[PDB]
Amino acid sequence: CYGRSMATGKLVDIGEAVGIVAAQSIGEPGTQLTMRTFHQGGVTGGADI
Amino acid sequence: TGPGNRPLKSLSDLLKGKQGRFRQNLLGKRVDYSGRSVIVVGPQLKLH
Amino acid sequence: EEVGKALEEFYPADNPIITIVKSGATGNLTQTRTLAGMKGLVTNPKGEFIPRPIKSSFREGLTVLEYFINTHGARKGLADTALRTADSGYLTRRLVD
Amino acid sequence: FSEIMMGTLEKDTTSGTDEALLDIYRKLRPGEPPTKESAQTLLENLFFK
Amino acid sequence: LRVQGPREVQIHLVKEVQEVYRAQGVSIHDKHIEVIVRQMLRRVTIIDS
Amino acid sequence: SGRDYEDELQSERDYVAGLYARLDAERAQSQRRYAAALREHGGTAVERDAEVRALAKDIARLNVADNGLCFGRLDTLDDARLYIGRLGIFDRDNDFEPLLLDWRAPMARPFYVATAANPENMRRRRQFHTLGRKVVDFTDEILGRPTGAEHDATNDAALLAADIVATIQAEQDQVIRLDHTGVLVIEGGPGTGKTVVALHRVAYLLYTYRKQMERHGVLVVGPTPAFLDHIGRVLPSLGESDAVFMTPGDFVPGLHVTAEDTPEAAEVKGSLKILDVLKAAVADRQELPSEPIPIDLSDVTMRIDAETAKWARDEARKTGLPHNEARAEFVDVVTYVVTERAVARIGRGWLTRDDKHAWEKMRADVVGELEDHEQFNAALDALWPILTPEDVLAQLYTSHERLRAAGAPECLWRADGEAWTVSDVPLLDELVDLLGRNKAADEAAERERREEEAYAAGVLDLMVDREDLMDDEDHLLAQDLIDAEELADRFKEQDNRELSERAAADREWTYGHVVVDEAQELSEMDWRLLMRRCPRRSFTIVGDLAQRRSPAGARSWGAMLDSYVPGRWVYKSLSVNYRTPAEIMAVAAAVLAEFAPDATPPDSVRACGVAPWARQVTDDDIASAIAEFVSEEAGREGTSVVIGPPDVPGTVPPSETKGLEFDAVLVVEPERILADGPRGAAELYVALTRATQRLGVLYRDALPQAL
Ligand SMILES: [Mg+2]
Numbered sequence: 001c002y003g004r005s006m007a008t009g010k011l012v013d014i015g016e017a018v019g020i021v022a023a024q025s026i027g028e029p030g031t032q033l034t035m036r037t038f039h040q041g042g043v044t045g046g047a048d049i
Numbered sequence: 050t051g052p053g054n055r056p057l058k059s060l061s062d063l064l065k066g067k068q069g070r071f072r073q074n075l076l077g078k079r080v081d082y083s084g085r086s087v088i089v090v091g092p093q094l095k096l097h
Numbered sequence: 098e099e100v101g102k103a104l105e106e107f108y109p110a111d112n113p114i115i116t117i118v119k120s121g122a123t124g125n126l127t128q129t130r131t132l133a134g135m136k137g138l139v140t141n142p143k144g145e146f147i148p149r150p151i152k153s154s155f156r157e158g159l160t161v162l163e164y165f166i167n168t169h170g171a172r173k174g175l176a177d178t179a180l181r182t183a184d185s186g187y188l189t190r191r192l193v194d
Numbered sequence: 195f196s197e198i199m200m201g202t203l204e205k206d207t208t209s210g211t212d213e214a215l216l217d218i219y220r221k222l223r224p225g226e227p228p229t230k231e232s233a234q235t236l237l238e239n240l241f242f243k
Numbered sequence: 244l245r246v247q248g249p250r251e252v253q254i255h256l257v258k259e260v261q262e263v264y265r266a267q268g269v270s271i272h273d274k275h276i277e278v279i280v281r282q283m284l285r286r287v288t289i290i291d292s
Numbered sequence: 293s294g295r296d297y298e299d300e301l302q303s304e305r306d307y308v309a310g311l312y313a314r315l316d317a318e319r320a321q322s323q324r325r326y327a328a329a330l331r332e333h334g335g336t337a338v339e340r341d342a343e344v345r346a347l348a349k350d351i352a353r354l355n356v357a358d359n360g361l362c363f364g365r366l367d368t369l370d371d372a373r374l375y376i377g378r379l380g381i382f383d384r385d386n387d388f389e390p391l392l393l394d395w396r397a398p399m400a401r402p403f404y405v406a407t408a409a410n411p412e413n414m415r416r417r418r419q420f421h422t423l424g425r426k427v428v429d430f431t432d433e434i435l436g437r438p439t440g441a442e443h444d445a446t447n448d449a450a451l452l453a454a455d456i457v458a459t460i461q462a463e464q465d466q467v468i469r470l471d472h473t474g475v476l477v478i479e480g481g482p483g484t485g486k487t488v489v490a491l492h493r494v495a496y497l498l499y500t501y502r503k504q505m506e507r508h509g510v511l512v513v514g515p516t517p518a519f520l521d522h523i524g525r526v527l528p529s530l531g532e533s534d535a536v537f538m539t540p541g542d543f544v545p546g547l548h549v550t551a552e553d554t555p556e557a558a559e560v561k562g563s564l565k566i567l568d569v570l571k572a573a574v575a576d577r578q579e580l581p582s583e584p585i586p587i588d589l590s591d592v593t594m595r596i597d598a599e600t601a602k603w604a605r606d607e608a609r610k611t612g613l614p615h616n617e618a619r620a621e622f623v624d625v626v627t628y629v630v631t632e633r634a635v636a637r638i639g640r641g642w643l644t645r646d647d648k649h650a651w652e653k654m655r656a657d658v659v660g661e662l663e664d665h666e667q668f669n670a671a672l673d674a675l676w677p678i679l680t681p682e683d684v685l686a687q688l689y690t691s692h693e694r695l696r697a698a699g700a701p702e703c704l705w706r707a708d709g710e711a712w713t714v715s716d717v718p719l720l721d722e723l724v725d726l727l728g729r730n731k732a733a734d735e736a737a738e739r740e741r742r743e744e745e746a747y748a749a750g751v752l753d754l755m756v757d758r759e760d761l762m763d764d765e766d767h768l769l770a771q772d773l774i775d776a777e778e779l780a781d782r783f784k785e786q787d788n789r790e791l792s793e794r795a796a797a798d799r800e801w802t803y804g805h806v807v808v809d810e811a812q813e814l815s816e817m818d819w820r821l822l823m824r825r826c827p828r829r830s831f832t833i834v835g836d837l838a839q840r841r842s843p844a845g846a847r848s849w850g851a852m853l854d855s856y857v858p859g860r861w862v863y864k865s866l867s868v869n870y871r872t873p874a875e876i877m878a879v880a881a882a883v884l885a886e887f888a889p890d891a892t893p894p895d896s897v898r899a900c901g902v903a904p905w906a907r908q909v910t911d912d913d914i915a916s917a918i919a920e921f922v923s924e925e926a927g928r929e930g931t932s933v934v935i936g937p938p939d940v941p942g943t944v945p946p947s948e949t950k951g952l953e954f955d956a957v958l959v960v961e962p963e964r965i966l967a968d969g970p971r972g973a974a975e976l977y978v979a980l981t982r983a984t985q986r987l988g989v990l991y992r993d994a995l996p997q998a999l
Contacts, residue, residue, distance in 0.1 A: 006272060020193060022275035027189030029269040031181050034330070034344060036782060038180050039143075046788035048348050075753040085762075125334045140342045174338045179768035181337070183779055186770075187751045192279060197474065197829040268331050 101130040132156060136163070140170050249284055256280050297443050304420065305427055307375075308362050311392055312425055314381060315361060319354045322347055353379070360422035360528055363395060364430070366403055367416040376400045378528065395527075396502075404499035404526070407492070409458075409465030411435040416442070419525070446953075448485060451870050451984075456897050460868045467864045468492045473501070475831040475857050477811075477849050480866030481894030482836070482880055482981035487809075487951075489866060490834040491522045494807055497832065498527060501805075506530070508804025509795050512537045513814075513822065516951050519807050536796050536803075540814060541714040543821055544721050545797055553713040555843040555969060557704040561715040562815030562844030570719065573688050573698040574615055574726055578605050578676050585671045587630060590661060592637050600629050601675060608676070614728030615679055622676050630668075631658045678730060681723035686710055715844070718817035724799065744784070749776035802827055810950065811835035815844040816852065823856045838887055839978050841947065841971040866894070871953065873900035876983050882998045883977045906989035914960060914990065918942040921958050921988065930955035935979040937964045946975045949982055957983035960990045 005012045012018065036045050050056055063069055105126060108115040114132075118124045131137070136151035136159065151163040159167065208214050212230060219226075219233035222240075226232065244252040257276050264271055326347040333340040357378040366374040374393055381392035393400045402412035414435050421428045431444035440453030452460070467478065467489050478493070480486030498505065510530065512520045517537045524531030541549040553561065560566070580601050587594040604625045608618040635654045636644065643650050662668050686709030688694050695705070712720075752771055761767075795801040806826045808814065812835040814822075823829070837848060846852045853861045869877055877896035884891045909917065918934050922942070925932035933954045936943030940960055959965075959979050966972040976996070980987065989995070 002274060019278055022278040023189065023192040025271055025275045026279065027185060027192050029264070029271070030185030030188055032269060033263070033267050034341060035181065035184055037144075037345075038177065044786055044788040046786065048345070048352050075750050127334045140338065144338070144342050144345070146342060146346065170336065170338050174336055175768055176773055177338050177341075179770055180773050182755070183752070183770040183774055184782065186755055187748070187779065187783060190751050190754060198827055201827045201829075266327070266330055 100134045101126065104130055104134040136167065139167050140173070142169050142173065144173070253277075253280050253284060256283070294443075301427070301429065304365075304430060308420075308425075308427055311361055311375075311377070311381060314391070315354065315357065315379070319351065322351050322354065326351060356529075359424065361425075362392065362420055362422065362427075363526065363528075364403065364417065364419040366400075366406075366414050366418070369413050369415050374399060376403050401499075404495050405469075406435055407461075407465040407468050408433075408435050409461040410469065421525070446488065448488065448871070451898065454898055456868065460870070463866060463868075464489050464492075467866065468496055470862065470864070472862050473497075474829050475833065475853060475861040477833045477853065477861060477863045478866070479834075479836055479849070479863070481869060482839075482977075483869035483872030483877065483896065483984075484866040484894050485871050486834060486836075486866050490809075490832065491519065494519065494523065494832055495526050498523070498530060498805065502527075502530070505804040506534060507791070508802065508828075509534045509536060509791055510805045510807065511535075511795075511803040511825065512807045512809075513540065514807075514809030515539060515813075516809075518951060519809055533790050533792055536792050538796075540818055541717055543717050543818075545799060547712065547717065547720070549712045549714050549717055551711060551713045553715045554703075557706075558713075558715045558815075559843045560701055561704060561719065562817050562842075564816045564820070566719065566817065567722070569698050569700050570723060570726060573694065573700075574679065574684060574723075575609075576694055576697045577615070577679055577684070578608070580605070580675060581671075585674070587665070587668050587671060589634055589658075589665070592634055594630060594634055596626070596630065596671060600626065604629075605676070614726060615676075616728045616730040619676060619678065619730060623672055626672065627659060627662055630662065631655050634658050679727050681720040681727065682710075684723055684727075685716060685719060715815075718815075718821050721799065721821050722817065741780075744780040745776050748780035752776055752779065801825070804828065805830045805832070807831075808833045809835070810839075811846065811849075812837050812840035813842045813845045814852070815842070815846070819846075819852045819856075829857050829860070838884070838891070839950070839974055841969075841975055841978075843970055869894035869896040870898050872896065872981060872984055873898060875900060875903050876980065876987055879904070879987070879999060880977060880981050883973060883980060883996075886973050886998055887977075900985055902986060904983075904987040904989065906991065906995060909961070909990050909992060914940060917990065918958070918960065925956045925958075930985075932956035932958070933982070934958045934960065935982065936960035937968065939964065946979050950978055952982065953984050954982055955984055956986045956988070958988040958990065961992055962989065962996050963992060966996060 002012050002016075002018060004010070005016065007021075064071060105115075108129075110116075110119075114129060118126055118129055131154070133154055133156050135154050138146050138150045140146055147166060151159060151167060153159045153163055208217055212233075215233045215237060216228055216230070219236060220228060222236060223232070257273060257280055260276050260280075261271070261273060326344065329340065329343050329347060333343065335343075360378065362375055362377040364376055366376065368374065375391065376395050377392040378395065379392060380390065380394040380397065382388040382390050390399075395403065402414050403417065406412045406414050406417065417433045417435055418430055419433075420430045429445070431446065432442040432449070433444065434442060434449055438449045438453040438457065440450055442449050470476065470493075476493070478486055478490050480489070498510065510523065512523070512535060520531060520535055520537045523535050552558075580598050581596065584598075585596040587596055604622045607625050608622040611618050611621045613621070632655075635651065635658055638658070639650070639654060643654060645651075688698065688700075688709070689704065689706050690709040692705070695702070752774075755770055757771075758766070758769060795803070803826050805828075806822055808822070808831065811833045822831075833849070833853070837846070840846070849861075849863065872880075874896045877893070881891075881893050884893055918940065919942070922932060922934060931954050933944055933949065933952075933956070934940075934942050935946065935949055935957055936959065938945055943960060946965065957979070959976070962976050962979075965976045965979065968975055
């Protein structure tokens with residue numbers, strides 16, 4: 001069901017730590033996403049998506 | 050209580066407080082057989 | 098935008114400055130425009146654009162006031178980059194858990 | 195000139211200089227006896243002297 | 244989840260997450276997001292035994 | 293609706309459609325640039341965020357502006373045209389000459405400040421009744437001498453056209469452009485159109501002080517939200533996100549009361565005298581045990597008697613705090629007394645006056661047991677319980693002994709205490725001050741906060757330290773700029789709500805301005821509530837003392853507006869009557885002779901083309917008579933109504949028709965209206981004055997004595 005291993009291109013071996021790999025892959029590019037404003041003042045930022 | 054007002058730590062208290070076991074560490078170990086140094090480009094090396 | 102387009106059109110295909118970018122080896126056309134075309138708009142300490150842009154290019158050399166207003170974003174970025182990692186680490190720890 | 199100040203005065207359940215001084219004294223010195231002499235003295239010795 | 248069921252809510256979650264990651268210029272394979280989304284819907288609440 | 297009007301409406305529709313097309317093009321460009329910036333900005337992170345936020349803010353503004361883009365139009369004496377809307381739209385390739393002016397722009401100031409007597413170089417003012425992207429119709433107003441050739445639903449210009457006009461305009465301008473910012477009272481007689489002046493005054497005041505009222509909000513009080521409707525029409529942002537409307541029955545949040553109360557009960561329940569009654573009634577709940585209570589500690593039997601409860605109540609009442617707060621003093625003293633009695637008998641004869649090491653520990657043990665004791669707490673709840681306004685009033689009305697204790701009259705008896713009326717709402721609101729809260733605190737929320745802050749601290753600890761960095765040079769770290777508490781709060785729900793709904797759900801909210809319509813209906817307690825909910829004393833009050841149907845309504849403005857702002861409120865009364873004919877005015881004056889010996893009425897300076905009419909009703913012909921009348925009138929032209937008691941199916945009760953004007957009115961059987969309580973004469977006066985062009989009367993045997 002998981003299928004090809006992204007790192008090597010072959011079918012995943014029994015015992016792969018797929019969960020931590022997925023977590024790291026999702027979390028690594030988190031710095032490129034836009035975030036809430038860092039300033040303390042102002043109104044709540046939910047008005048603008 | 051004993052001396053002062055501090056209570057006496059019971060046996061089960063060895064497994065409950067912030068200090069004890071069943072507890073993880075967010076800080077990492079310091080490991081022997083390790084070193085550190087500046088890196089420079091070696092263009093004659095192979096990928097391994 | 099128009100100044101950037103004109104600059105992109107003008108440069109010869111074999112000029113090193115634009116050859117470095119077009120080959121994908123390094124950089125992007127925004128940096129080339131800033132270096133040669135014009136710096137453009139800059140932000141206040143609050144993060145809002147200043148109406149008057151920096152019409153000079155680093156090849157020509159910014160004036161005193163243009164440089165002073167430009168320093169705002171440079172100073173802001175140092176703290177912005179440091180603060181950006183906290184949210185990423187938070188989400189990464191959640192996902193790992 | 196301001197309605198909010200007049201409203202605060204209307205809702206202020208304190209009358210006279212001595213009572214206000216006693217209130218301030220008991221506020222700043224909750225554990226001390228409510229003597230009038232100290233109640234008058236501390237305020238003068240806190241900011242104005 | 245209530246209207247369509249567990250299958251469609253997982254597809255919806257994966258689509259929504261990948262939509263943000265695509266719009267922000269990040270490329271992650273759907274399987275990494277699926278690994279995380281699977282863990283979210285592993286329980287069933289009992290209403291009557 | 294002349295063909296010229298249709299052509300003008302079509303032209304305005306075409307112009308608004310062009311404006312909307314330009315708006316859609318701008319939206320598309322902004323969205324495309326926003327997507328491109330999010331995807332491949334290629335610059336520094338700060339610059340990318342700045343551009344993205346600017347584009348998102350612009351897109352949100354465009355989204356907000358979609359509903360009702362254009363408000364109205366202004367015509368200058370120079371023949372130039374100005375269009376007022378929610379956004380500023382300018383033609384880039386035509387030297388930026390405006391196609392639409394933001395309502396906040398200085399050039400749009402005359403739209404709100406201009407008046408007929410003192411125009412700001414403007415000839416005519418127009419307003420579009422927008423509905424989505426479509427304009428249903430528009431109303432015109434001449435800022436000068438009336439012409440009589442314009443179109444508007446109110447038809448006020450036509451009536452004015454049919455000096456006296458200069459004097460009326462000057463008086464209206466004097467009312468509208470008053471520089472006062474406190475309590476203002478407007479009371480014009482019937483047919484004077486004081487409603488239009490009130491709406492114009494509200495618009496002017498809200499525009500002038502908009503910058504200091506966009507956060508406090510505006511509260512509209514009255515039978516119908518028509519004032520809120522106008523505020524939304526002319527100030528859609530404030531109306532949509534800042535204006536809250538509450539009928540006098542909806543003062544208490546979440547309790548939509550509609551039932552009325554009899555005059556005998558309402559007249560007393562609406563007076564300030566009830567404040568003493570409420571204070572006495574809650575004091576009654578501070579009762580005593582008729583017989584001693586066996587508290588029955590786990591080891592030694594214990595007894596509470598009437599005298600210890602007496603002393604505890606004396607202490608609690610001495611403290612003077614609200615009921616739920618003096619509960620602490622009452623329970624504390626009762627617990628101390630019971631603990632002393634129990635300790636004296638547990639350590640029989642031994643421990644008395646010994647050092648702290650024994651007596652204090654015994655006291656602590658006894659108090660700890662008491663705090664968990666079920667029957668002791670049940671007893672403490674039997675006398676001096678925790679109270680709520682609903683429970684207090686329900687158990688006050690339903691019992692016949694507590695009313696005598698509280699000093700209330702025998703008239704406000706009712707079998708069911710939970711049948712709330714509009715008169716009970718202010719008492720429910722008031723009782724909150726008397727009762728208060730028992731120092732409520734939350735425990736699960738604190739645990740959640742602690743856990744989240746600890747998780748944020750762990751996240752920060754997970755990051756690399758400065759001691760062992762591997763970068764080429766030292767630099768700012770996250771730990772140097774943010775702490776665990778701030779990081780944890782960064783990911784919480786942070787729920788956000790509109791100001792309108794946010795204030796509507798809060799009892800303690802203080803509003804920036806209060807608008808009251810038909811103010812004569814409000815009683816002393818309603819005014820107390822409203823003045824409690826607006827400490828700035830910024831009020832716009834409209835009504836007529838002679839037209840109240842609520843027996844508890846204000847007898848005069850000075851009786852109501854003098855216990856809060858004595859000598860500071862401004863009063864202005866409009867004089868001339870033009871919205872109604874001379875014959876209707878004479879009939880109204882004839883009815884008015886029964887109210888006051890003098891009753892200075894608004895003189896009429898206009899007469900209708902046809903006089904009123906009256907007829908008898910015999911052998912139950914009203915059923916077909918009303919149908920024939922409405923068929924004849926509605927089919928011809930204009931809006932016609934039938935006014936009478938609900939006993940006739942085809943009658944609109946006076947309670948609903950007060951705030952409307954009609955071309956034709958048919959009042960049926962005025963005797964029944966005159967028999968409707970002490971205010972029957974006022975009801976008939978109102979119904980007769982509703983007529984603007986033609987009035988019909990049906991009576992059983994003879995016309996009322998006055999007529
Ligand atoms: Mg480096």
